Symmetry: C2
Subunit: 1038 residues, 2 copies
């Protein structure tokens, strides 16, 4: 559970971070570190613009950690030593889930140093805790003078770009106050925004240091005392010449400087003696809160209790995936992976009585992902933002681990789909609002001077943390919980969503996984889910240009650059929902079936000229976003075609399963009728031709008419359809898609293709300024791993899947030395206009590297397809917890975005992981773990009755010596298997004898066989079973 | 005439810069320095987005000059020394009008070091010249291994904000080529924009080092060879443990890194002996210009002649205010003040036969004026644009020092007063245009394939530097001066003026001074 690295100074560099969780009733912070110096480079409160230690990218972090990080100076009998400055002295590093500790053992000076880090949990102030201890390991008494702290503290109110670009002029606003009380307060004199409405800052940073007794020490805020003329912060010139007592009596400057924070003590240590310091660095809202917090002394017991609480917080957070196998690295990796998935996706919780809330979420923006602008609210019930794809993928298995979530994720992520099939990029924090009538009714039993403020606050959008802060401000330190619960309960949820950057062509493909996962826990709720009318529609900000206005000419030929219609761009911060009566009525609502029909109809009308792929006409590529220039070359993708085929098949099956009446909007009905008329025509033409220019023109004209109709508003009337007509129309669409897939497979070769690029040699210029293409020439593309991954989800024969696996394993997508699968083949012979993927060195980032996400997707598809032996063999070699820590160059408990492959020209980078944790492979590993431990479908419905059964698939190298393997089912129930012998247990090669159930009240029940039906299934799903005993082929034997 | 500061490392900090004048027929560069380390922090060609050494504000400059600036390592009999790193060893600093020189006298090791800087004048390539010399002041022969250069060269095509915001991701595009020829070329291969359009990059930076004979040395572009695992760039771990000859045979990575440029030699010095290196760091638009420039070997005579020309340029520029009094400080201050006024206002010169032109003007941003975005045209007859108030004040006494100017300033600055009494903020740089008939008549005596391009270029607004570049591109290295003079003479002046920001209430009060001075 703890990873130890020896002599990390000379090892290869890597970056990581503390989780930053501070509990429900706490203020979180973000902190990053590297394996150099004292291993902290930057930390703050909210984002990059509120940093206490300046934020740097990884390259600058590795270079500036030793100078701008935490510093420590020891003077022993007149000579100055600096720990963690020379790599030839033995040092050590320990990493926990929610902590960090380093130590150094200098055998020449006979002094040992140790410093630990953790975030302060469960308080009204967010801060970083640092404990430094120095021990005298010599045989004679010594006289010690110690100085510890940081050399550069950014005053509150200074933005990141102000420090990066104009850090010299910005020093005029900086100041530090309250030195006498021992609580320095760093803030600007006035707001640096020349056009502001405050001109006064209440918040600020602070620092406090004390010994075990708890009495605060006198700080040093002038860096010129320690370093004198050396402005490089490398030599403590001032400290080498004068005693600490003389320095503490000096006069310090508090204005027109970049202040620091140093604390010092003087002591004489007996042989074996030691001394310890405790430090707190953080941010407070105002001086009154700081005085209230420091009204009572803080001593060693307080800090050790806080450390225990910090450890227990992460332990309880990750307790939901606890498992025991034959290797402890597997269990530690499972816990760390679950923690990272929670960090990037959020942790569901039950707030009030009818609200579901996600906490601890944020945007992956670590030192190596320097292009992301992360955010994290510094308040109770903290939450953050994120991108559509990442948050959509990370919440795939929430229902299994928390049954009370229900259909919330489906409703949330199907309500962000616009009427034109696209969606915004960013998802924002949840917020609530309360009507004036309910506010008046609830707040009758409170004083008027408080009632007015409370109602004025509650009549505006707010977050639960803001409400808690308002209650603390108004009612004081103590306030009633029932009033807060009622206010939360009677509030209304507000919509969220920001356009952000543009339109991708793959964001809609991850929604079906939510439905498939939900139906694996509540199989009998399908009809209710399909015809529930709660779903809303987001209001688009920009519209896509028509095809004739989307093309421009250049010396290299015809291109596609003007994807978006900039003239019809709506302003932000406006209405975010589609309303009836052309934007003047109430909110429009749809059923899930209507959303599925809308997605099926629109995406079918985006096929390319040859009718094989789906055009990326939004200006952005698909999942592989390193090919940013592909949309300029009339690109199209086959993965979208495979996903469309799967969605159409599922929709047809759903329509045939539950006959009834379906209500559709007028514009969608007309568009669907036009598409049906088009597709029933030319049916003999698409089956007997190569180019389909006429069909492309017809479908594009229909789609453009629909877009232009629906962008400006919709009346709101509904048409009525019977399920049979929709089923027939979708069957025709599926037949067309299947023919296109067959044509693409024939054209490409033995491995299914992924992308296509078209050349238009001849065209026509229209009188309106548009350009009309006249012919298309397809061009092949190198092999990509996404193709087979998407293809294996389609229903095909087992032999074809095995043949595809054999073809892939001996192709260029398999790395022989590393026994891993690369993301793509060689791009050397392709055009340089594909994007930045061509400019990357082979074996780096998204270029012929071992991208972990796609490899885990491929392994999961292999497991789901029934190829158990191959899945086991490849998982034994590809999994992170089975790697060599020396070659991997990192903790084997943490995931990585990619691993450099053998094509990398640097011999010392082959096999290393980069871009830290918080990758998308966490959810893939969670799905693989769940399917291995419990099977594909734990719950089934038979004869209108719930049925529960288990079907594990466990390899030999995971069964312990005694044959007892245990795992957590739905995070509440423990399942304990007992296997007869040491062998691979594949479904169909074993039979379960009996099961024993232990209820929470002490009662027991025994069931013979592997099937349970009736009330016991309801009890086990409801969480009324505490433990299960499962026997496979009787007791274990050796 | 020269100001000498002793032990500048322990003194109070200050910032300054080279004037950055390369003459009429030269490419100017901008360079800033502080009184720490080896006293160079950043330099480029055009603006902050075309820097060769990364631009920092004054605070970051003071903090990082000792690590990201020029470095020098000396190995004497197995021990490695670094000059200009310890302030307890006596050092020196000399400041000229258009130059800078530093030196260190180490009495313990017995070796002295001297470094000089100056901008390369009168050439088609803008670059910085650096000369390093080491003298053996001991009494016995020593075996010397020298390494000198800079540890961070920004490849061409990388913007400042991309370097200071996403410098980790930006390393994927960086690469260096042409190591065998001795002329490394630093550039990115394609645009870094996240758009559907991808462009091609042709420009790049370069470096070249040689001894007195003129033969170029073998460069080192992988910083991991020198510093090994120490990413703080403080100790040369790799150089201490291995000989330089072994390092020169090592394999170097040329991708996914922030490249450096170090050159090394090995020599045994007799008592009183010395060795010298000459360096050139600059920026070019395409490899063809670099090959044309380096078509002939450069040696010590070339560099010393260039240094003499660089000094004489400033001397002749400031000769107009020469005076002799009872104090030399006053006399030097007069010339320095005149040079600074010329830099911020421009130097009036007589171009053609009926045109008046101002050279050396620019935007005056620097390390301490970090809020300004300075610019400077990298071409012949360099000029720039400035504010109304500053240019109005700086050209007050032009008529006294140059009677041929006449009433040009009055006409120019009284024509920017609008009908409501206010004025625009910015004054644009001078540009010219030629009519169709004059272009047809002038270009009769030239070949048609050149005549068409010449008339197409001349029928659009242009600057004299652009015209010189076009003439060099078309006619080659040699072209007729009379044709250029006629084209300039028969051209027409374009009206200048840009609104920009808004209306101040004092800009109109400086116009009467021009009339009173005239
Ligand atoms: O391929 C590397 C990563 O690129 C990221 O896109 C970056 C943009 O956000 C940013 O604005 O520009 C840079 C440089 O053009 C882009 O690299 C993607 O968002 C990542 O998914 C990708 O891993
Ligand atoms: O007062 C200092 C200097 O301020 C400069 O304006 C700055 C702006 O250019 C910048 O965008 O914002 C900062 C902070 O508000 C301003 O100080 C003036 O241009 C200078 O004349 C002045 O000396
Ligand atoms: O480009 C490959 C991957 O890079 C990373 C992004 O977060 C993903 O959305 C993308 O699929």
């Amino acid at each position: 559970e703890t990873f130890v690295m020896d002599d990390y100074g000379k090892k290869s560099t890597f970056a990581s971070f503390l989780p930053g969780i501070a509990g429900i009733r706490g203020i979180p912070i973000w902190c990053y570190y590297v394996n150099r110096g004292q291993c902290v480079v930057s930390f703050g409160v909210d984002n990059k613009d509120h940093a206490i230690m300046e934020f740097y990218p990884a390259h600058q972090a590795y270079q500036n950690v030793k100078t701008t990080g935490f510093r420590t100076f020891l003077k022993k009998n007149g000579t100055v030593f600096e720990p963690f400055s020379d790599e030839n002295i033995t040092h050590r590093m320990q990493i926990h889930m929610n902590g960090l500790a380093i130590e150094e053992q200098n055998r020449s000076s006979g002094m040992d140093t140790k410093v630990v880090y953790y975030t302060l949990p469960g308080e009204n102030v967010g801060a970083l805790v640092r404990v430094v201890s120095v021990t005298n390991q010599s045989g004679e008494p010594i006289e010690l003078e110690l100085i510890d702290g940081m050399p550069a503290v950014i005053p509150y109110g200074v933005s990141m770009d102000s420090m990066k670009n104009m850090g010299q002029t910005a020093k005029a606003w900086m100041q530090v106050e309250d030195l006498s009380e021992g609580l320095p307060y760093y803030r600007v004199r006035a707001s640096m925004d020349d056009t502001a409405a405050v001109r006064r800052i209440d918040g600020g940073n602070f620092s406090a240091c004390c010994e075990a007794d708890g009495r605060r020490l006198q700080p040093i805020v002038d860096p010129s005392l320690i370093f004198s003329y050396d402005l490089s912060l490398k030599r403590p010139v001032g400290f080498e010449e004068r005693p600490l007592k003389e320095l503490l009596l000096e006069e310090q400057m508090t204005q027109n400087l970049l202040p620091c924070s140093f604390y010092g003590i003087t002591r004489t240590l007996a042989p074996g003696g030691s001394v310890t310091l405790y430090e707190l660095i953080g941010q407070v809202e105002n001086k009154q809160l700081l005085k209230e917090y420091f009204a009572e002394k803080k001593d060693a017991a307080y800090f050790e209790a806080k450390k225990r609480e910090a450890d227990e917080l992460a332990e309880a957070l990750t307790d939901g995936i606890r498992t025991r196998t034959a290797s402890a690295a597997f269990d530690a990796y499972c816990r760390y992976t679950y923690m990272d998935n929670v960090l990037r996706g959020g942790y569901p919780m039950q707030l009030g009585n009818n609200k579901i809330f996600y906490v601890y979420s944020r945007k992956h923006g670590d030192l190596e992902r320097d292009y992301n602008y992360f955010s994290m609210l510094p308040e109770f019930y903290s939450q953050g933002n994120g991108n559509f794809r990442d948050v959509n993928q990370n919440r795939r298995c929430d229902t299994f681990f928390a049954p009370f979530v229900g259909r919330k994720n489906i409703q949330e992520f199907y309500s962000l789909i616009q009427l034109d099939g696209y969606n915004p990029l960013g998802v924002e924090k949840l917020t609530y609002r309360l009507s004036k009538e309910r506010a008046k009714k609830l707040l009758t039993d409170v004083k008027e001077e408080q009632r007015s403020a409370l109602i004025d606050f509650a009549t505006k959008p707010f977050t639960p943390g803001a409400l808690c802060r308002k209650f603390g401000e108004v009612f004081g330190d103590t306030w009633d919980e029932t009033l807060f619960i009622r206010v939360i309960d009677f509030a209304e949820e507000m919509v969220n969503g920001s356009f952000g950057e543009g339109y991708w062509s793959d964001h809609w493909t991850y929604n079906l996984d939510l439905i498939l996962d939900y139906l694996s826990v509540f199989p009998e709720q399908e009809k209710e889910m399909l015809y529930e009318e709660v779903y809303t529609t987001f209001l688009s900000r920009i519209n896509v240009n028509r095809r004739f206005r989307r093309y421009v000419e250049t010396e290299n030929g015809l291109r596609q650059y003007r994807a978006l219609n900039e003239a019809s761009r709506r302003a932000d911060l406006g209405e975010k929902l589609v309303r009836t009566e052309y934007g003047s009525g109430d909110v429009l609502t749809m059923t899930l079936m209507e959303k599925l029909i809308l997605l099926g109809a629109v995406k079918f009308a985006t096929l390319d000229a040859y009718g094989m792929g789906i055009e990326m006409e939004g200006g952005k590529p698909g999942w592989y976003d390193a090919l940013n220039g592909m949309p300029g070359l009339f690109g199209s993708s086959m993965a979208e075609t495979y996903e469309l085929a799967r969605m159409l098949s599922y929709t047809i099956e759903a329509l045939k399963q539950y006959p009834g009446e379906v209500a559709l909007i007028e514009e969608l009905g007309c568009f669907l009728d036009e598409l049906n008329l088009i597709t029933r025509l030319e049916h003999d033409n698409i089956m007997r031709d190569e180019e389909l220019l006429s069909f492309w023109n017809r479908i594009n004209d229909a789609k453009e008419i629909y877009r232009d109709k629906t962008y400006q508003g919709v009346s709101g009337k509904k048409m009525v359809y019977h399920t049979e007509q929709l089923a027939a129309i979708l069957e025709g669409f599926l037949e067309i898609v299947t023919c296109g897939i067959k044509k693409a497979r024939r054209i490409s070769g033995e491995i299914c293709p992924t992308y296509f690029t078209y050349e238009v040699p001849e065209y026509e210029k229209l009188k309106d300024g548009g350009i009309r293409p006249l012919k298309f020439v397809p061009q092949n593309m190198p092999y990509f791993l996404e193709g087979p991954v998407r293809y294996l989800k389609l229903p095909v024969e087992q032999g074809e899947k095995r043949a595809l696996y054999e073809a892939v394993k001996e192709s260029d997508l398999y790395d022989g030395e590393l026994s891993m699968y690369k993301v793509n083949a060689s791009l050397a012979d392709s055009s340089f206009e594909l994007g930045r993927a061509r400019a990357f060195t082979p074996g780096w980032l998204e270029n012929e590297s071992i991208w972990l996400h796609m490899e885990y997707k491929y392994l999961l598809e292999l497991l789901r397809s029934g190829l158990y032996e191959e899945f086991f063999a490849d998982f034994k070699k590809a999994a992170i917890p089975f790697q060599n820590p020396e070659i991997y160059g990192r903790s084997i408990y943490e995931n990585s975005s990619f691993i450099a492959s053998s094509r990398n020209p640097n011999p010392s980078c082959r096999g290393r992981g980069f871009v830290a944790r918080l990758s998308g492979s966490t959810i893939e590993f969670i799905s693989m773990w769940k399917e291995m431990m419990f099977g594909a479908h734990p719950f089934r419905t038979e004869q209108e009755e719930l049925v529960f059964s288990l079907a594990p698939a466990i390899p030999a190298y995971l069964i312990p010596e005694d044959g007892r393997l245990s795992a957590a089912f739905m995070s509440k129930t423990t399942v304990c298997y007992e296997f007869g012998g040491h062998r691979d247990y594949v479904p169909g090669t074993y039979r379960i004898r009996h099961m024993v159930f232990f209820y929470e009240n002490g009662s027991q029940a025994t069931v013979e066989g592997e099937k349970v039906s009736g009330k016991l299934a309801e009890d086990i799903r409801a969480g009324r079973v505490r433990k299960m005993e499962v026997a496979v082929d009787l007791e274990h034997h050796h």
